[PDB]
Amino acid sequence: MDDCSGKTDAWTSIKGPKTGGYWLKQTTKTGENECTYVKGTDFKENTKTATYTYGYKDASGKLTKTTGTATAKGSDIVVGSDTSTVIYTDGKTCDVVKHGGHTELWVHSSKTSGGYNNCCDKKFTETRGSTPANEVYKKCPGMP
Numbered sequence: 783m784d785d786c787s788g789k790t791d792a793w794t795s796i797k798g799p800k801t802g803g804y805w806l807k808q809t810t811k812t813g814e815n816e817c818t819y820v821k822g823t824d825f826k827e828n829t830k831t832a833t834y835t836y837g838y839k840d841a842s843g844k845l846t847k848t849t850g851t852a853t854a855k856g857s858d859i860v861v862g863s864d865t866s867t868v869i870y871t872d873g874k875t876c877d878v879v880k881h882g883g884h885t886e887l888w889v890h891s892s893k894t895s896g897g898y899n900n901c902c903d904k905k906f907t908e909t910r911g912s913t914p915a916n917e918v919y920k921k922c923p924g925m926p
């Protein structure tokens with residue numbers, strides 16, 4: 783599917799629709815933290831950087847919060863020591879990225895119940911291949 787190919791721009795991915803945030807829906811990693819999320823704010827076109835707040839649900843059921851910076855480097859999203867490479871993004875509803883050998887499907891907070899771009903499911907399935915997927919978004923609080 784032509785429009786599912788070549789959608790690898792990290793800056794577009796970081797920004798999304800510039801409101802809400804993204805939840806990690808599925809990952810090839812086992813033991814991932816439930817309700818892992820990221821949320822970009824204060825998008826700077828000059829530098830292709832954004833403030834990035836991220837975390838996950840702690841033992842008591844509240845979201846953790848750490849704030850740093852996301853920097854676009856071509857296909858790559860860099861936050862601190864961590865780099866993720868964009869496999870597919872629509873800049874609106876979802877992304878597929880690779881981080882540290884793992885394949886991840888991220889979904890915008892507006893689309894947690896489904897109805898995001900099919901290219902995300904296609905590219906997630908393709909990229910993970912035979913590595914099983916693990917669900918991460920379960921009984922999550924709303925997006926900070």
Ligand SMILES: NCCc1c[nH]cn1
Nearest residue numbers: 795796804820877888
């Ligand atoms: N919309 C980009 C979501 C993401 C995944 N990894 C880091 N950020």
Ligand SMILES: NCCc1c[nH]cn1
Nearest residue numbers: 836859861864865866
């Ligand atoms: N490459 C961005 C990895 C990440 C996800 N969440 C926080 N950092």
Ligand SMILES: NCCc1c[nH]cn1
Nearest residue numbers: 806818864866881886
């Ligand atoms: N491991 C912290 C960064 C990250 C990547 N994917 C999810 N979170």
